[PDB]
Ligand binder design. Sequence first.
Ligand SMILES: OCCN(CCO)c1nc(N2CCCCC2)c2nc(N(CCO)CCO)nc(N3CCCCC3)c2n1
Ligand SMILES: [Cl-]
Ligand SMILES: [Cl-]
Ligand SMILES: [Mg+2]
Ligand SMILES: [Mg+2]
Length: 209
Amino acid sequence: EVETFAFQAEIAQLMSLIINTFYSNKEIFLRELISNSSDALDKIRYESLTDPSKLDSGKELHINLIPNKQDRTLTIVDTGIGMTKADLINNLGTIAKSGTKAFMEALQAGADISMIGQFGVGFYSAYLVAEKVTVITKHNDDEQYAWESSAGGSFTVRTDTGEPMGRGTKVILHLKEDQTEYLEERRIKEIVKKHSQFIGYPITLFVEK
Ligand SMILES: OCCN(CCO)c1nc(N2CCCCC2)c2nc(N(CCO)CCO)nc(N3CCCCC3)c2n1
Ligand SMILES: [Cl-]
Ligand SMILES: [Cl-]
Ligand SMILES: [Mg+2]
Ligand SMILES: [Mg+2]
């Protein structure tokens, strides 16, 4: 079964502002998702220091970037702490309420979309380049879930039946027709060097073949 939920009103409003505002500096989306992945890897490494069994689900701590020109997708894979069902459906949302509300105050008072990260809501910057986002995730304490939204006020959560990951998150960006530059090898490398040169984990760009 697939469950369907409404976004909270303020998040539906942020998503609509990110989709509708003319704004050319779209490349900042990659920094925000790599920064989220780095947070998740920090959390599992920290927890593993007092409880080594947390790494039984896998020891490697990395980020892979996987462009696919045929499917028009860009996938960010990490082996971080992953997210529970309750994270996906409400807990990460309730923590976002205040950053979302403040970011939207800041934008009306002159701030631009590139400061989204400073409010803890960088994930939604995905919607600068993607018409749909799929988030496949596995936390030690829960089962594998797929989250998915094409915006429009709702999102879905289902149990995931495909290729089981051990622990961590796959973000699948279904790119807009005019945003294929972000599948180009030299553009991904330019963006990673410019915005995220200082991440404490290996970032491997997979080449297509
Ligand atoms: O890059 C996107 C994928 N990842 C996985 C990285 O492994 C990711 N990580 C987040 N975090 C770091 C790993 C522990 C959880 C936090 C995180 N945090 C929040 N929120 C808390 C704010 O800090 C709400 C605001 O976005 N929301 C996320 N979303 C995306 C899917 C669920 C819905 C909203 C989210 N997503
Ligand atoms: Cl993760
Ligand atoms: Cl609908
Ligand atoms: Mg990510
Ligand atoms: Mg990810």
